Design a protein around this ligand. Structure first.
Ligand SMILES: Nc1ncnc2c1ncn2[C@@H]1O[C@H](COP(=O)(O)OP(=O)(O)O)[C@@H](O)[C@H]1O
Ligand SMILES: Nc1ncnc2c1ncn2[C@@H]1O[C@H](COP(=O)(O)OP(=O)(O)O)[C@@H](O)[C@H]1O
Ligand SMILES: Nc1ncnc2c1ncn2[C@@H]1O[C@H](COP(=O)(O)OP(=O)(O)O)[C@@H](O)[C@H]1O
Lengths: 75, 77, 52, 67, 52, 500, 104, 77, 62
């Protein structure tokens, strides 16, 4: 949405989490890593967990449907 | 064509060319890391470039002075 | 003023500010084209006089 | 047509003001409109036309009050 | 539309402006204090001010 | 043909056709006018700023269009100075009397009014025409140079204009023998600078692949001559044609020095690869020559023509002054100069830019037209949109004097005379309307020769600006325009006769 | 260094160009009526309703247009008229010129 | 090999051909340069500028550019 | 009326009316066809004002 690099930042955050930096995230100002605690980018645990669980549940629901049958259209 | 940011490179190279006059300070298209174009062994004939500029100017001037085209526009079926 | 500021705001945003000034500069051009007399002249003497 | 309504109510205004001359004012107005439309198709911006018409009217009334 | 009569109408119009406002303490001018009738026909030279 | 009935509707159709035919050339008047490019079949679109040149390539089909083009062609043939002016002037006459034909104005009334207005205009121009021929014409030619300078005033070639004007008027003063476009033929050459351009008193052509094969010609020969040969010169019955070929090849070598010819002319290719066979001749050869070259050489001293297989005449190496063949810009050029009556002038268009061909066409040719009209004519007036203002003012003043039908028609005529400054200043690009009012005030009160300046786009007293126009040529142009307008107005209906 | 982001997707950009084109159509239809030297607008209603004036926002209320950008330009003009009461015609012209600048 | 319809495109085609048989390389340069020249020429025309002065300024600019090209020349064997 | 202004001695040529009986130019002050000054002045003023108002109206397209 800002035209920044994708793969380089993915690898950078992968390495940062490899050292254990669970606070290393992207910054739109510079496109680099930073401390979200210091940088102020913080998110609610409950909201994020609900988002993840709901996405997984909806995906599971959708994948369980195989055949769709259509009756006579009214138009 | 490549993908780098155009205008920041434009301004930086212009500032450096102000610092030192050189026809070898330009875009590093091959991402060699240096703007020293001569170091990258790129040579083109000066006659080609002057002819390019002159031809482009003459053609643009000619097109600027022409405002007549005839069309029937009947929209045949 | 915005033009000279964009000259001193060298960067990616400098030409954005320059175009802002150029686009905003249309109202005197509208008034001048209502008067027939060259709006480009009108505004270039306006520029010179305001500079002086 | 709205332009016709404007012209006819100017005519009624003139008639209520002085009486005679409604035909003359309507005819002169129409002639001025068509001549000015030709002259604006001659690439003249209409405000100059309006200013010239006002100056001409002033000079005409001053001439009439003099001759 | 009132171009030539703008100079003419400015004094009377401004004087009517202070009639509906307090020129000393009223920080806001009510646009609803003045009402206009769209009298079919007429001439700008026949400007008429009414206080009632 | 829509509403092409007998009477006024067909006249309206003719006037509309005249307006349309004017629109095509309406924008090319003047030296700084735009050019026209229109498809003409196989895509050979031609660039030509001259309005008459546009006229020769139009697609006129309406009878009014044809009967205006013929008048334009006649005017062009009579003089080359001013053809857009007459057509556009006639179109203005027609379109400004069009708001009168429909009221019931019988066309004969318009014809009478046009003729009397033309007579008044001719009298007015005659009584104001100023003669400046005696003002140092034969001697002190600086006035001619100043007049020629107008052709390149305030342009990128103004620095080189002085020398070019001086030497072209020098060439003309000994060539004041009714010159024309073909008589003075220039040639374009690349390389070098534009300052050292010259005008030889002869011709100039390049030895192309089909022009000359032999080199190191005897340049320092004082008896040149053209030999026109209508035959080729280049290199179980097969043996028969072989023998015929050998005999012809041997026979074609007997017209080199046995006949005594230094320059041979032929319409068949001359082989440069066969130079070793052309080297034995030791004589210049010219092939695929243009008809312009042929006529200029014939008028210069007169070359011989051979018709038979071994035709020989006494003018094979007759009287011509000297031969010249000098390489220019690294390439050998042929100069058939050095003749007793070499009444030709070829300009060496020295210049790096190849595309300046049209620019030099519109500069040097206009300058030499200016000097030729200044020399040939004697009485000129300051125009460029000034003299037309004088005529319009006088006619409009005279209109109020006379009572009768023709008063309004003469008024419309005078109103139509103002179009020349309009078009000139519009082609310049300035605000046309302001120029008109400024000219009218400064002309009615100020002076009788205030005209437009194309350089700074403002008025100027054109008498000081030296914007001269020959009085006689202007009179003829106005007469032709009035005659064309009268001829169109006096017409009611066409006759079709499609098949039977 | 070298290349950054490929920027593969482009259609919403040209859609925004279309929006700017509509905004300029409205803007230069509005532009003329500014100043004493100026001349009234040039806009006819599709339904046929007619008004005749020199104040811009009245014309802004004339149009029954489709593109939301034009509608929100009308909102901008009426908001400016509510706030101060002058220069409303200028605001629309400035907005259109800025939109063309954004295009460039 | 383009399906050229308007004569201006054909004129650009002969421009490209002239550059190609004159030099061989840089044929892309003339087309893009003319494109950008017209890019700002059309806004200059929208401002209400007649083409004559635009053409004269463009020719002056071309002379300036050619002078710069001559100034920054460098040749080898 | 051209002689009324060009010729300064022809001052008393300014009332050539239209004798509708024959449709011939004729002295009209002697004839006596008269129009009040206020009538013509107001007529011209109102015609000019109407022309200005109409010419000042172009805010449609049709
Ligand atoms: N006896 C007359 N001869 C010539 N013209 C006349 C005569 N009487 C009136 N007129 C003309 O009639 C005109 C005004 O008539 P008109 O305006 O039609 O009257 P109304 O306004 O009542 O219709 C005047 O301009 C005047 O010149
Ligand atoms: N420098 C100049 N200043 C003013 N008028 C000029 C100038 N040069 C040419 N003209 C005008 O251009 C007219 C004719 O030009 P043009 O139509 O281009 O060629 P042609 O003479 O073949 O018709 C002349 O009547 C002349 O008055
Ligand atoms: N007498 C005048 N001389 C010069 N400019 C004027 C004059 N009157 C108004 N203007 C200009 O007209 C512009 C717009 O004013 P106006 O049209 O009244 O507001 P709106 O555009 O909201 O209707 C102002 O910027 C002002 O500078």
């Amino acid at each position: 949405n800002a035209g920044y690099d994708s793969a380089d930042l993915v690898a950078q955050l992968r390495a940062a989490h490899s050292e254990g930096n669970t606070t290393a995230g992207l910054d739109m100002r510079e496109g680099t890593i930073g401390d979200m605690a210091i940088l102020g980018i913080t998110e609610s645990f409950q909201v994020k967990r609900q988002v993840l669980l709901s996405a997984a549940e909806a995906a599971e629901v959708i994948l369980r449907v195989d055949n769709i049958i259509k009756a006579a259209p009214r138009k | 064509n490549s993908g780098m940011n155009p205008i920041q490179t434009m301004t930086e190279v212009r500032a450096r060319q102000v610092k030192e006059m050189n026809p070898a300070l330009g875009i590093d298209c091959l991402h060699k890391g240096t703007n020293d174009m001569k170091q990258q062994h790129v040579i083109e004939t000066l006659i080609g470039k002057k002819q390019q500029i002159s031809l482009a100017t003459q053609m643009v001037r000619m097109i600027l002075k022409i405002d007549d085209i005839r069309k029937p526009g009947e929209s045949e079926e | 003023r915005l033009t000279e500021y964009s000259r001193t705001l060298s960067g990616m945003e400098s030409y954005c500010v320059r175009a802002f000034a150029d686009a905003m500069e249309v109202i005197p051009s509208t008034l001048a084209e209502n008067a027939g007399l060259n709006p480009i002249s009108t505004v270039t003497e306006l520029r010179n006089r305001h500079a002086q | 047509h709205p332009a016709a309504k404007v012209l006819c109510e100017l005519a009624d205004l003139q008639d209520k003001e002085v009486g005679d001359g409604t035909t003359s004012v309507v005819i002169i107005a129409a002639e001025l409109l068509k001549n000015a439309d030709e002259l604006v198709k001659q690439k003249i911006h209409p405000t100059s036309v309006i200013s010239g018409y006002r100056l001409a009217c002033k000079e005409a009334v001053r001439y009439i009050n003099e001759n | 539309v009132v171009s030539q009569y703008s100079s003419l109408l400015s004094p009377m119009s401004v004087n009517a402006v202070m009639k509906v406002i307090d020129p000393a303490t009223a920080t806001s001018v009510d646009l609803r204090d003045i009402k206009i009738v769209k009298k079919l026909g007429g001439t700008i030279d026949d400007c008429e001010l009414v206080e009632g | 043909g829509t509403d092409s009935s007998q009477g006024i509707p067909q006249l309206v159709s003719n006037i509309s056709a005249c307006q349309v035919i004017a629109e095509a050339v309406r924008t090319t008047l003047g030296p700084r006018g735009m050019d026209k490019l229109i498809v003409d079949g196989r895509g050979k679109a031609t660039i030509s700023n001259d309005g008459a040149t546009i006229l020769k390539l139009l697609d006129v089909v309406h009878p009014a269009a044809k009967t205006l083009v013929d008048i334009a062609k006649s005017q062009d043939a009579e003089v080359g100075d001013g053809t857009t002016s007459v057509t556009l002037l006639a179109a203005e006459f027609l379109k400004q009397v069009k708001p009168y034909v429909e009221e019931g104005l019988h066309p004969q009334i318009i014809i009478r009014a046009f003729r009397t207005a033309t007579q008044l205009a001719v009298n007015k121009i005659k009584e104001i025409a100023v003669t400046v021929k005696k003002a140092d014409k034969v001697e002190q030619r600086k006035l001619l140079e100043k007049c020629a300078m107008t052709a390149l005033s305030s342009k990128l070639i103004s620095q080189q204009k002085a020398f070019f004007a001086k030497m072209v008027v020098d060439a003309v003063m000994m060539l004041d023998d009714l010159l024309q476009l073909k008589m003075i033929g220039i040639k374009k050459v690349q390389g070098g600078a534009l300052e050292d351009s010259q005008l030889v008193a002869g011709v100039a052509f390049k030895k192309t692949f089909s022009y000359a094969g032999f080199e190191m010609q005897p340049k320092k020969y004082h008896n040149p001559k053209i030999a026109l040969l209508n035959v080729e010169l280049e290199l179980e019955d097969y043996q028969a044609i072989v023998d015929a070929e050998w005999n012809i090849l041997y026979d074609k070598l007997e017209k080199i020095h046995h006949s005594g010819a230094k320059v041979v002319l032929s319409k068949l290719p001359i082989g440069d690869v066969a130079t070793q066979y052309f080297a034995d001749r030791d004589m210049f050869c010219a092939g695929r020559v243009p008809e312009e070259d042929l006529k200029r050489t014939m008028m210069a001293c007169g070359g011989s023509i051979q018709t038979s297989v071994n035709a020989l005449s006494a003018d094979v190496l007759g009287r011509c002054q000297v031969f010249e063949e000098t390489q220019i810009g690294g390439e050998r050029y042929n100069f058939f100069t050095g003749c007793p009556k070499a009444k030709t002038c070829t300009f060496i268009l020295r210049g790096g830019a190849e595309q300046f061909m049209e620019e030099t066409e519109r500069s040097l040719h206009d300058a030499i037209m200016i000097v030729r009209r200044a020399i040939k004519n004697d009485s000129v007036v300051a125009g460029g949109g000034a003299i037309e203002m004088e005529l319009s003012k006088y006619l409009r003043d005279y209109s109020r004097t006379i009572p009768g039908k023709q008063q309004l028609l003469i008024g419309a005529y005078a109103k139509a005379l103002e179009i020349i400054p309009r078009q000139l200043c519009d082609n310049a690009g300035f605000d046309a309307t302001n120029i008109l009012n400024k000219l009218r005030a400064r002309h009615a009160q100020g002076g009788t020769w205030y005209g437009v300046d194309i350089n700074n786009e403002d008025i100027a007293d054109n008498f000081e600006a030296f914007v001269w126009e020959p009085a006689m040529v202007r009179i003829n142009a106005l007469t032709a325009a009035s005659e064309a307008a009268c001829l169109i107005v006096s017409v009611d209906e066409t006759i079709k006769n499609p098949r039977s | 260094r070298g290349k950054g982001a490929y920027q593969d997707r482009d259609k919403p950009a040209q859609i925004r160009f279309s929006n700017i084109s509509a905004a300029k159509a409205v803007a230069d239809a509005i532009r003329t009526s500014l100043g004493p030297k100026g001349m009234d607008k040039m806009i006819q209603d599709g339904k046929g309703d007619v008004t005749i004036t020199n104040d811009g926002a009245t014309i802004l209320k004339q149009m029954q247009v489709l593109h939301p950008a034009a509608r929100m330009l009308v909102e901008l003009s009426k908001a400016q008229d509510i706030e101060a009461g002058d220069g409303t015609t200028s605001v629309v012209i400035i907005a259109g010129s800025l939109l063309d600048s954004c295009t460039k | 090999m383009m399906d050229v319809d308007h004569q201006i495109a054909k004129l650009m085609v002969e421009l490209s051909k002239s550059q190609d048989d004159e030099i061989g390389d840089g044929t892309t340069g003339v087309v893009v340069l003319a494109g950008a020249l017209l890019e700002e020429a059309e806004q200059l025309l929208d401002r209400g500028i007649h083409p004559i002065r635009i053409a004269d300024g463009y020719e002056q600019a071309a002379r300036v550019a050619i002078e710069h090209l001559d100034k920054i020349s460098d040749s080898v064997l | 009326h051209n002689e009324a202004q060009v010729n300064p001695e022809r001052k008393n040529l300014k009332w050539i009316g239209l004798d509708l009986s024959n449709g011939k130019p004729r002295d009209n002050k002697q004839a006596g066809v008269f129009e009040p000054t206020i009538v013509k002045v107001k007529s011209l003023k109102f015609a000019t004002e109407a022309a200005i108002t109409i010419l000042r109206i172009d805010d449609l397209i049709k």
